[PDB]
Amino acid sequence: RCPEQELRLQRLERLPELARVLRNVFVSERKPALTMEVVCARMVDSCQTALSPGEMEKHLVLLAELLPDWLSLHRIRTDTYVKLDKAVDLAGLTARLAHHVHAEGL
């Protein structure tokens, strides 16, 4: 197993917990979208993670790639807005995330 892939597996292992942290940040926010910068700052501050905000951004992007029906990113000028589809349950998402990760077979 090569380094790039070991790194991906490292990141993928964090996602279920990070997804919950993300959802909680949005539950506490009245606004429907937040900039990536803000979201990353709130996520790193919301748990005991070993990640920098830059590394957190990388994980959020992975999440957006794995769960595009839940997590959308929209560039407006130099900001990137993060929006959650709140019409989906973290339970359903969590099962889908697990399935996707497993299906990669590493």
Short mmCIF file of C-alpha atoms in Angstrom, two decimals, residues 33-99:
data_model
loop_
_atom_site.label_atom_id
_atom_site.label_comp_id
_atom_site.label_asym_id
_atom_site.label_seq_id
_atom_site.Cartn_x
_atom_site.Cartn_y
_atom_site.Cartn_z
CA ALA A 33 -24.72 28.22 4.48
CA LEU A 34 -21.31 29.09 5.90
CA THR A 35 -18.00 29.84 4.19
CA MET A 36 -15.45 27.00 4.12
CA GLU A 37 -13.09 29.12 6.19
CA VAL A 38 -15.70 29.57 8.92
CA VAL A 39 -16.82 25.95 8.84
CA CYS A 40 -13.25 24.68 9.16
CA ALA A 41 -12.55 27.03 12.06
CA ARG A 42 -15.70 25.88 13.83
CA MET A 43 -15.01 22.21 13.15
CA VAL A 44 -11.45 22.24 14.44
CA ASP A 45 -12.65 24.14 17.53
CA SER A 46 -15.55 21.75 18.14
CA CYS A 47 -13.61 18.58 18.81
CA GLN A 48 -10.20 17.37 19.97
CA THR A 49 -8.88 16.84 16.43
CA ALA A 50 -5.22 16.68 15.35
CA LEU A 51 -6.08 18.61 12.18
CA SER A 52 -5.24 22.16 11.12
CA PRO A 53 -7.99 24.20 9.44
CA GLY A 54 -6.24 23.52 6.11
CA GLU A 55 -6.25 19.78 6.76
CA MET A 56 -9.88 20.04 7.88
CA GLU A 57 -10.74 21.68 4.55
CA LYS A 58 -9.23 18.68 2.81
CA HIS A 59 -11.50 16.32 4.79
CA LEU A 60 -14.58 18.43 4.13
CA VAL A 61 -13.83 18.28 0.42
CA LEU A 62 -13.54 14.49 0.65
CA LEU A 63 -16.93 14.47 2.37
CA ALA A 64 -18.38 16.65 -0.41
CA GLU A 65 -17.01 14.17 -2.93
CA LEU A 66 -18.36 11.12 -1.10
CA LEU A 67 -21.75 12.60 -0.21
CA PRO A 68 -22.55 15.16 -2.94
CA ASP A 69 -26.31 14.94 -2.31
CA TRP A 70 -25.74 16.08 1.27
CA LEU A 71 -22.81 18.47 1.11
CA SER A 72 -22.62 21.14 -1.59
CA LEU A 73 -19.83 23.68 -2.22
CA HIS A 74 -20.49 26.91 -4.11
CA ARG A 75 -17.88 29.49 -5.07
CA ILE A 76 -19.02 33.10 -4.75
CA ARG A 77 -16.22 35.54 -5.50
CA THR A 78 -13.30 34.41 -3.33
CA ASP A 79 -15.48 32.58 -0.78
CA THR A 80 -16.64 28.99 -1.00
CA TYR A 81 -19.98 28.37 0.65
CA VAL A 82 -20.79 25.10 2.39
CA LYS A 83 -24.44 24.08 2.42
CA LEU A 84 -26.07 20.99 3.88
CA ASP A 85 -29.23 19.41 2.54
CA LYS A 86 -31.07 19.13 5.86
CA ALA A 87 -33.67 16.88 4.22
CA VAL A 88 -31.33 13.93 4.82
CA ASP A 89 -30.73 12.12 8.14
CA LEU A 90 -27.21 11.73 9.57
CA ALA A 91 -28.21 8.10 10.04
CA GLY A 92 -28.86 7.50 6.35
CA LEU A 93 -25.78 9.52 5.38
CA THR A 94 -23.66 7.59 7.82
CA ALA A 95 -24.69 4.25 6.33
CA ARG A 96 -24.07 5.56 2.81
CA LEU A 97 -20.67 6.93 3.83
CA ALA A 98 -19.69 3.56 5.33
CA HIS A 99 -20.82 1.76 2.17
#
